[PDB]
Ligand binder design. Sequence first.
Ligand SMILES: CCCCCCCCCO[C@@H]1O[C@H](CO)[C@@H](O)[C@H](O)[C@H]1O
Ligand SMILES: CCCCCCCCCO[C@@H]1O[C@H](CO)[C@@H](O)[C@H](O)[C@H]1O
Ligand SMILES: CCCCCCCCCO[C@H]1O[C@@H](CO)[C@H](O)[C@@H](O)[C@@H]1O
Ligand SMILES: Cc1ncc(C[n+]2csc(CCO)c2C)c(N)n1
Length: 176
Amino acid sequence: NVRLLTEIAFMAALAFIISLIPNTVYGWIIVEIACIPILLLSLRRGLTAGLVGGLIWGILSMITGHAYILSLSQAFLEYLVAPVSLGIAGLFRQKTAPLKLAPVLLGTFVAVLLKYFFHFIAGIIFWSQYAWKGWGAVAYSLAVNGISGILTAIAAFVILIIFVKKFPKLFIHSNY
Ligand SMILES: CCCCCCCCCO[C@@H]1O[C@H](CO)[C@@H](O)[C@H](O)[C@H]1O
Ligand SMILES: CCCCCCCCCO[C@@H]1O[C@H](CO)[C@@H](O)[C@H](O)[C@H]1O
Ligand SMILES: CCCCCCCCCO[C@H]1O[C@@H](CO)[C@H](O)[C@@H](O)[C@@H]1O
Ligand SMILES: Cc1ncc(C[n+]2csc(CCO)c2C)c(N)n1
């Protein structure tokens, strides 16, 4: 009870602190390293924990003034649904030894793809006034959010491979 809750809370606060690190490549093409703590949380504690972690992270972003909000529905999509959706990594939780790297990677792939799918949808609806010269709404959003999603996946792969090799205990919960 108290262990699980403190972990959800610490991973959400860490996601938020990490989102203060400058992460822009160009305009909205970004490297979203703040996903990582929520991915770690979901992989270790499962679907529900991760969902709740992402929800808390999203709320922190909004209530501290760090979220970019264009409307109620845009905020719902990009700062509730999108961060929550990272919890899908938890379907790839490993409960028993030995820890394999592949599930970690697949979970991450799927979770980051899902998050950036929601950003892609939002890009079409809410951000198309910024589209580059000659680019339609769909094309612009696919580029921006596709690229960000790939870069974010990259960063998550690199960090999580390091954690697997150097801190494998992180990925498997044990009582005792
Ligand atoms: C549910 C658990 C919640 C724990 C979250 C506590 C950590 C959040 C602190 O954020 C701070 O917000 C300030 C706004 O006043 C910013 O100026 C500052 O840069 C930033 O560091
Ligand atoms: C692509 C989005 C939806 C796909 C969700 C399907 C995931 C199936 C997860 O079951 C698997 O069960 C094993 C035994 O428990 C785990 O050890 C393993 O790591 C886990 O991967
Ligand atoms: C991080 C990169 C973001 C991924 C963007 C890829 C979008 C691919 C959409 O998947 C799809 O699902 C089915 C129902 O949703 C649709 O019938 C199908 O036509 C659609 O293409
Ligand atoms: C084309 C386009 N431009 C901006 C955004 C907005 N956006 C992208 S990632 C993100 C969350 C990072 O905190 C937000 C709000 C978008 N979806 N698509």
